[PDB]
């Protein structure tokens, strides 16, 4: 059983541990937001705006840093920064949960605001490090480990997505059970300790991956960062894979989704916790099914064909959702149609996400890989920022319908862009 020590499985294990830590810490921050502050749209929206704006500004910088440095150095530095930021965030969360009563009742009104500012800043740093490690590990390391074998690359990307979704659905359950059977302070302490141990393990895991793969070793003072940012965006605009990236970014403008504990429109609206949990589980299983569908489609059709088919599926499911919205309290038929439309949209969208990921991994030269992927993340977070702005501007319930249309419209728009990419690449159906 040499599979347990191969580069591919060690990469899988490292990604699994990193994603588990990330999701546990995300759930801890969500619990911090819910317990201290009420179910407020403004606070979660401000957190999302801060994270999205920071990544939008610094995507090119992070990509350039990944591109200009050795692979092991950037991977380990990003790992250490992410885990240390998560450890500090966990310690602060344990401290606030320990003094929750005093903060809510006895202490002045500025201490809670200071705690929120500190938590969102540490979360922004952790998310920046997570974006850096995602860029480097996924793009560079998975492409190099796969090499010239595209089937292996597609299987590795699909397995990464499956691990990500399973962790997204399991880590909230584990942290919730731990917190309830103990206390939120115990939960935050466990999260901090687990992140420390996982950092220690993942350092050695990345070092061992770097050994078994010998191909990884080959490869105003703000004028320079601004020049790198401009050069990165100009290079991104001149890539053949640009409309596909634009479509993938536009697919982030949607409100229709159940994959996020906080910053989700359904939770902000006031939907019951049990229904939200059921919908998140259904979205996770359907996302796994979508990754399987992508892996199957890529072999039969091409890759651009796989993207087109996935976009067609997602548009059909969102058409079902629109029919639900326009269908004449509210009848349970409309709600069931909307939920089915969103879930089947997820199954049709994960395949397109994997297709665009494979296109970026294949058609971006090794010299521009980090910068182009950083700019792609910047575009994704820019359209996520637009989504958060839209959610802020329309908080009243009797506008939800409108949002749906907007969201669906953008999806269509995104896929239209990808369709143009197809016409620029194949010229055949």
């Amino acid at each position, epitope marked *: 059983a040499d599979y347990l020590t191969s580069a591919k499985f060690l990469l899988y294990l490292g990604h699994s541990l990193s994603t588990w830590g990330d999701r546990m810490w995300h759930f801890a921050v969500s619990v911090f937001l*819910v317990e201290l502050y009420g179910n407020s749209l403004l606070l979660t929206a401000v957190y999302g705006l801060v994270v999205a704006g920071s990544v939008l500004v610094l995507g090119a910088i992070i990509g350039d840093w990944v591109d200009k440095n050795a692979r092991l150095k950037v991977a380990q530095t990003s790992l250490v920064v992410q885990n240390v930021s998560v450890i500090l965030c966990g310690i602060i969360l344990m401290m606030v949960f320990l003094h929750k009563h005093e903060l809510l009742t006895m202490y002045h009104g500025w201490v809670l605001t200071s705690c929120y500012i500190l938590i969102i800043t540490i979360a922004n740093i952790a998310n920046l490090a997570s974006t850096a490690t995602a860029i480097t590990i996924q793009r560079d390391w998975i492409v190099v480990v796969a090499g010239e074998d595209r089937s292996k690359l597609a299987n590795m990307n699909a397995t990464i997505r499956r691990i990500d979704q399973l962790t997204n659905i399991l880590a*909230p359950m584990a942290v*919730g059970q731990i917190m309830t059977f103990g206390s939120p302070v115990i939960g935050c302490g466990f999260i901090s300790g687990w992140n420390l141990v996982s950092m220690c393990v993942e350092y050695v895991l990345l070092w061992k991956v770097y050994q078994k793969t010998p191909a990884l070793a080959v490869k105003s003072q703000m004028a320079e960062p601004f020049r790198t940012f401009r050069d990165g965006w100009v290079s991104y605009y001149n890539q053949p894979v640009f409309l596909a990236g634009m479509g993938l970014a536009f697919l982030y403008m949607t409100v229709l989704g159940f994959d996020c504990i906080t910053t989700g429109y359904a939770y902000t609206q006031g*939907l*019951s*916790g049990s*229904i*939200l949990s059921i919908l998140m589980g259904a979205s996770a299983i359907t996302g796994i099914m979508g990754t399987v569908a992508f892996t199957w489609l890529r072999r039969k059709c091409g890759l651009v064909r796989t993207g087109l088919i996935s976009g067609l599926a997602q548009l059909s499911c969102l058409i079902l959702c629109v029919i639900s919205v326009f269908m004449p*309290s509210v009848p349970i038929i409309s709600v069931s149609l909307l939920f089915a439309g969103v879930i089947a949209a997820r199954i049709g969208l994960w395949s397109f996400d994997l297709t665009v990921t494979q296109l970026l991994q294949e058609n971006v030269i090794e010299s521009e890989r980090g910068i182009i992927n950083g700019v792609q993340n910047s575009m994704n977070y820019l359209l996520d920022l637009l989504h958060f702005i839209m959610v802020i501007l329309a908080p009243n319930p009797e506008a939800f319908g409108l949002l749906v249309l907007i969201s669906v419209s953008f999806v269509a728009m995104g896929h239209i862009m990808y369709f143009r990419f197809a016409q620029n690449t194949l010229g055949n159906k």
Partner: nanobody
Amino acid sequence: VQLVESGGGLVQAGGSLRLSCAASGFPVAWNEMRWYRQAPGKEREWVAAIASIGVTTYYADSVKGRFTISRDNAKNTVYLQMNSLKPEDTAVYYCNVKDYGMAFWYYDYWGQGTQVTVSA
């Protein structure tokens, strides 16, 4: 996200009553609203419920038929209409919300409660 109750009092056996539960911090059209009875000398018991997504009622067998639970989203309230009250229904009624929160972190939120007395 507390909710209050009103409409309790003392009525003759076989009369009619309407208990109104007003919620503030959440929608009532998407949360499973419930009613509970707490009788003197014994633990609280289930009375009625209403679904979260649709509109379905789940009255308990002991009080099924003579009770009605109806939600109103415009006023964000839940009404328990009690008809043909019996002397053993004298208790304290608690409005309840089950599974309110985020995805995997939800709780049960109770109300102050209203005293209902039945005499013959």
